[PDB]
Amino acid sequence: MASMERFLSVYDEVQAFLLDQLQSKYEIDPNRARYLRIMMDTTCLGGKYFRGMTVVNVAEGFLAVTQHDEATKERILHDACVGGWMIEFLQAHYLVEDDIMDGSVMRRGKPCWYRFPGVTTQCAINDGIILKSWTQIMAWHYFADRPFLKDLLCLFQKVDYATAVGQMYDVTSMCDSNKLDPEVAQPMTTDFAEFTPAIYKRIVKYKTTFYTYLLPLVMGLLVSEAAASVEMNLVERVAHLIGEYFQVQDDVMDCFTPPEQLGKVGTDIEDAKCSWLAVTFLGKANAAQVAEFKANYGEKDPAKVAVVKRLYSKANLQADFAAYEAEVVREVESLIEQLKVKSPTFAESVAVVWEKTHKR
């Protein structure tokens, strides 16, 4: 059975379990069950399932080199699929809430969930809460007897917390740290002294890399009972590295990829986000360019945004990106080599993860 075919089949099974449980144990009525079914499909489906499929792919790699009864192979693949859906539903939670938090309009060519006419923000915040609650329902049901349940739940929590801390770093990245204060309305930075590579890397590490790369890789190891085949410090280093490159690509696409391709109108400039483009531009601009950036960044005015986009183009950030990518390619390959020491199979899975990231 092909990997994606199995993964999608498990979605239907998990969805049926969750909705049937809501009827048998939570007194749900059929119309609310239908609401939640539509909410699940709308928020969890339609992507490429890269995070969930990484769990499956890691587990398949170990299956090829480990002796098991057929029923055990099937159990491991089913576990990897459920775990992959835990990650996809966790991402769904983040995307629903982030879209509300940022006042976003579109995601993947369709309206953000909170903007659907019969949803609204009042329901959508709670729908997002439910999406994350469903990840825990999945784990306690499907993994109740598994030796890895404890380690999996502990990992999932730590990843979730790191991601929420990362969201805090992201939403406050255009403030001056010394001015943060619940009592005082927050002005945008004027000096941009905190738009540095180290601060950018901290934002991205926490807001993206734990749930997009560390979680799927480690969950694949856990459902495979293979965490001893790897040096965990190496898995963390390579996950944070690939994850940062993934976010840098996203940052570049927000500015330069056409809306129809992006599936949304990017507003990192109007939102004054600490993007890779802003940080890298400031790391090479002269005094006049810095001043013109300061006069235009973080404003909704289309003329001011266009000015920022000119400044980026004229700064030849394409060359900086090729240099960054060359260094990431160098460093990921080095970490993969270190991973072959204890597991050529896992190192090959990481290699596949990197190719899928690098090509898109």
Add this chain to the structure above:
Amino acid sequence: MASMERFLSVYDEVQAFLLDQLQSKYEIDPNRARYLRIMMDTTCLGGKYFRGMTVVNVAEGFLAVTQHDEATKERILHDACVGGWMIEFLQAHYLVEDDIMDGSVMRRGKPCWYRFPGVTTQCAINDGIILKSWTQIMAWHYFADRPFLKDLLCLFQKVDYATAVGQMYDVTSMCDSNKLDPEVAQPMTTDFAEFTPAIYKRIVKYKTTFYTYLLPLVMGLLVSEAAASVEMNLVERVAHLIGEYFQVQDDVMDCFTPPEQLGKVGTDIEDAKCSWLAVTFLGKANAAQVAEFKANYGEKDPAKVAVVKRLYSKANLQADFAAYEAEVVREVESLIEQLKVKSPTFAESVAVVWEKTHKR
């Protein structure tokens, strides 16, 4: 050491742990640590701590009848305090998000957290996410070696899920179930056919009773390793019963308690909530009264709200409340008697919980 004194001391210890961990493991800077410290204090402190103290009180009851070394008594009391704070932080999460969802203005005489000038909804949604994440950080840290960790985490999840499902029932309680549809903007019911005692009881059971009564009582049993001293079906029945009475009191106060005493301006009428007052009024109104209620309920117009308040007063719902309370007093006492069969100590703790609920 007095119970409340110990409970508050543990707050400072937990807060110090969480913030110190954010510095040592999450790369936090001192200004964001201060933001989160203020957010924690503002959202978690200032109430009566009834839920958290119930854990402590249940554990103290067992301590009085169970042989332990002194260090073990101290460990149990510390565990009960941490568990109580897990519940208070979970409530803090719900209140932050509910206030955003409902567009609330005040809570306990102070602005809702999202309305603080340097917070805003963009930060406050995530602050609420962090509050719940902190409950899991607490459990995995303080209870890492405890035999009850698994049972406690599983219970906490189920309670959280039931509460989120309850919030869905609450926010959709003024819609017609057959009309729910993400694609279509939701009109308020016109027939109010779903304002029934059974439907009201389902809302309250899920939205309030699991986290306010079932969770503190069962957590007290868990940290005491005393779940065998009770019939769990009885604990559930008494928790749901007391919890419903608690919410009925809240519903009555929303309408009739002065704002300065309530700590907010109640808007259940303008919000068209399925309150105990609306359900009970419809369960005794004549045809003309039903019509006048339909013409006025769920509108912000102060004259229409006053009309609804007149209809309630003229309907003598005070008599219905005294009848409801008399029946609850009857039924709680019956369940306490059944609880004495296996544990007079736990039955006495439940009795204390009921008195604290009944008097306020």
